[PDB]
């Protein structure tokens, strides 16, 4: 199955990060959208989030769910985190190969002042 | 002669015979030969006490043997000193503790059954009794 | 695909003995002429053609012209 | 395989590279069960003849007709095709424990050991080898097609006299046909049944018989001359 073989595809990184106690930036990439949020090292408390489903970002994009949509959410979360104080994050691949719009979301947030 | 085939190990420890038995109820037959005393019971005693039951009924009934030797008993040869290893395996014995049901039978009258069990208990080295099936 | 690993895949126009000329892509490099196609189907003639068993007493009655 | 009575016939052979020509006006027919020793000076068309005979060059005239029941195995001068990076087993056998030689099948270890390469020796790298073992492994590598037409181009290059006598014996019970190029007159004297002697101006003499009666034919058509060398120098 797709999702079941994906959780196992990224469990070692999900577990190594927790053992280091580092704040993580998880990424979810559905065919129609893309999501990103930042969670506390424990994993229960989530601080900030940004996504293409959210209207403030979906207002400017003709098609949510491509690379130009990934750049929007990546910049959106980076501007949201830096206002709060979170500047030290660890990127969570979450299973998707770091090639496509997953990458553009990382590069945009990285260029927008996030230190990782 | 009731000697196991393809045993994992050839020699075992002496061990101890403690506790009370487990197969203490008649299961298949209607009359069983329950043991009261304690001891070890070899393969030839099983065989000799089965040819006696079979002759008494002589045509009929099913004879169930519940116990199985599956235990090697060694002995040193004659006129040898102590040490220099462990003795060779000679015979196989089945450990019996109070309450164990040894033999059991169905298809024969109770009085003729009692006769066959008395002849069977004269070849066995432990104090055994005669017990019948119940309903729990 | 994998960039010039497979043999070439060209669109030939093969032909039958009764026509049936159609456009199919194959690794031939030349449109061959061959025997019948599905249009000349032995699906409604070949079944009874294969049957070649039966008839001995009728053979006797042919030999029994006397 | 069983070989018929039309093995190889060449008619009006002609070859040239530019102005200088190797072979011209050459023809012959080879019978069954024959060993043909080919002799001549260095660089005279001996190897080009084999390249023609097995589909590698083109004569200026043509008509080299093989038989319909001929399977060709060839062995050339230089042991360059094989790589100096594989063990003897992996090279000769190709990594397969079974070796179907022509018709039957034999274990690869046994087949390679028939050429004096035992279990220990079957792990040696080809580059980590001697000259004689290199030639032996060349022969064993290229003689596995099971064809009854041997084209040997100086197979006695760096073989000791014991292996030479082994080849001399093994070349006589082989029922097919063999064409051996060799500058070893003593080797060819034992096994040669037909002669292909090269001469000046592209003359390719064909003679039937061994060297012993080839000498008698020459003495019948005798010409006596002994001024062979010049023996000048290298430097002043």
């Amino acid at each position: 199955d797709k999702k079941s073989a994906r959780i196992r595809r990224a469990t070692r990184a999900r577990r190594k990060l927790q053992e280091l106690g580092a704040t993580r930036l998880v990424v979810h990439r559905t065919p129609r959208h893309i999501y990103a949020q930042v969670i506390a090292p424990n994993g229960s408390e989530v601080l900030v989030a940004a996504s293409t489903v959210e209207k403030a970002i979906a207002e400017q994009l003709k098609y949510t769910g491509n690379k130009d949509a990934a750049a929007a959410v990546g910049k959106a979360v980076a501007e949201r985190a830096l206002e709060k104080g979170i500047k030290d994050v660890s990127f969570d691949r979450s299973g998707f190969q770091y090639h496509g719009r997953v990458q553009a979301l990382a590069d945009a947030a990285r260029e927008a002042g996030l230190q990782f | 002669m009731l000697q196991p085939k393809r045993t994992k190990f050839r020699k075992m420890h002496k061990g101890r015979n403690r506790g009370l038995a487990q197969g203490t109820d008649v299961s298949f037959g209607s009359f069983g030969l329950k043991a009261v005393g304690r001891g070890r019971l070899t393969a030839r005693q099983i065989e000799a006490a089965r040819r006696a039951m079979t002759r008494a009924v002589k045509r009929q009934g099913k004879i169930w043997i519940r116990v199985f030797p599956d235990k090697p008993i060694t002995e040193k040869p004659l006129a040898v000193r102590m040490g220099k290893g462990k003795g060779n395996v000679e015979y196989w014995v089945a450990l019996i503790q109070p309450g164990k049901v040894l033999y059991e039978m169905d298809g024969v009258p109770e009085e003729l059954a009692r006769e066959a069990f008395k002849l069977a208990a004269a070849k066995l080295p432990i104090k055994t009794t005669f017990v019948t099936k119940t309903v729990m | 695909m994998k960039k010039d690993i497979h043999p070439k895949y060209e669109e030939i126009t093969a032909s039958c003995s009764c026509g049936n000329v159609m456009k199919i892509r194959s690794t031939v490099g030349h449109d061959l002429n061959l025997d019948v196609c599905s249009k000349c189907h032995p699906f409604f003639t070949g079944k009874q053609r294969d049957v070649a068993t039966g008839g001995r007493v009728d053979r006797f009655n042919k030999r029994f012209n006397i | 395989p069983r070989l018929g009575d039309k093995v190889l016939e060449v008619s009006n052979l002609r070859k040239s590279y530019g102005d200088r020509l190797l072979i011209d006006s050459l023809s012959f027919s080879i019978p069954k069960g024959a060993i043909v020793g080919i002799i001549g000076p260095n660089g005279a068309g001996k190897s080009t003849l084999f390249r023609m005979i097995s589909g590698q060059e083109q004569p200026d005239s043509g008509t080299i007709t093989l038989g319909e029941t001929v399977k060709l195995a060839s062995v050339d001068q230089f042991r360059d095709s094989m790589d100096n990076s594989k063990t003897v087993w992996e090279e000769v056998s190709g990594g397969l424990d079974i070796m179907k030689i022509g018709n039957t099948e034999m274990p690869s270890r046994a087949y390679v050991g028939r050429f004096n390469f035992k279990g220990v020796d079957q792990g040696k790298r080809v580059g980590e080898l001697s000259g004689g073992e290199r030639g032996r492994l060349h022969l064993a590598k290229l003689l596995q097609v099971g064809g009854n037409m041997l084209l040997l181009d100086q197979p006695t290059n760096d073989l000791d006299i014991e292996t030479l006598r082994a080849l001399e014996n093994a070349l006589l019970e082989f029922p097919g046909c063999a064409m051996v190029i060799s500058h070893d007159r003593w080797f060819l004297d034992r096994i040669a049944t037909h002669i292909l002697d090269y001469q000046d101006e592209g003359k390719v003499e064909f003679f039937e018989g061994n060297f012993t009666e080839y000498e008698e034919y020459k003495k019948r058509t005798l010409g006596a001359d002994a001024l062979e060398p010049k023996r000048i120098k290298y430097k002043r």
Binding site: - | - | H6, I24, S26, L34 | L96, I98
Partner: protein
């Protein structure tokens, strides 16, 4: 291509009416077609595999993968790692093209042809069929390869049953019995 459009037009309107499906996607469809050539006796030499690979490259518009042994078995004297078969998987346009040139040009060329035994399914609508010969396709002209390699073809479909696959394959007028 042509057969794909043939499906999309006159196999959906056939099978939905035939089986009274409640949804469009419930109709069965072919997903992939697999060509196997188990060269078997190739432990002797690799040429039997090279020529079989060329053969599959001819019939199929792809290049064949080499599948090797999985278990070392002495009943056939093979050990794990030995290359034993050539396999080609076709999905989509090339699958449709091969299907066209199978059921049009290839399958009527069978010597002593009488059709396809429609019983020969595996209980899930997937159909398996051998050919026993290599000369059926015009990609190779007979006296080029020594052996006559017989191969196997497998059509895989999404039928939860077997009569569904049979109806699907009869919609394309197979030489069934």
């Amino acid at each position: 291509a042509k057969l794909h459009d043939y499906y999309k037009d006159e196999v959906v309107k056939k099978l939905m009416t035939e089986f009274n499906y409640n949804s469009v996607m419930q109709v069965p469809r072919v997903e992939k077609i697999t060509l196997n050539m188990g060269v078997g006796e190739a432990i002797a030499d690799k040429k039997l595999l090279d020529n079989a690979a060329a053969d599959l490259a001819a019939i199929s518009g792809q290049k064949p993968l080499i599948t090797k042994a999985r278990k070392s078995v002495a009943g056939f004297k093979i050990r794990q790692g030995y290359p034993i078969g050539c396999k080609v998987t076709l999905r989509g346009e090339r699958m449709w093209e091969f299907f066209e040139r199978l059921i049009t040009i290839a399958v009527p060329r069978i010597r002593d042809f009488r059709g396809l035994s429609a019983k020969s399914f595996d209980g899930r609508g997937n159909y398996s069929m051998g050919v026993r010969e290599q000369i059926i396709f015009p990609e190779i002209d007979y006296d080029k390869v020594d052996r006559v390699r017989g191969l196997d073809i497998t059509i895989t479909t999404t039928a939860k049953s077997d009569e569904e696959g049979r109806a699907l394959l009869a919609a394309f007028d197979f030489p069934f019995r």
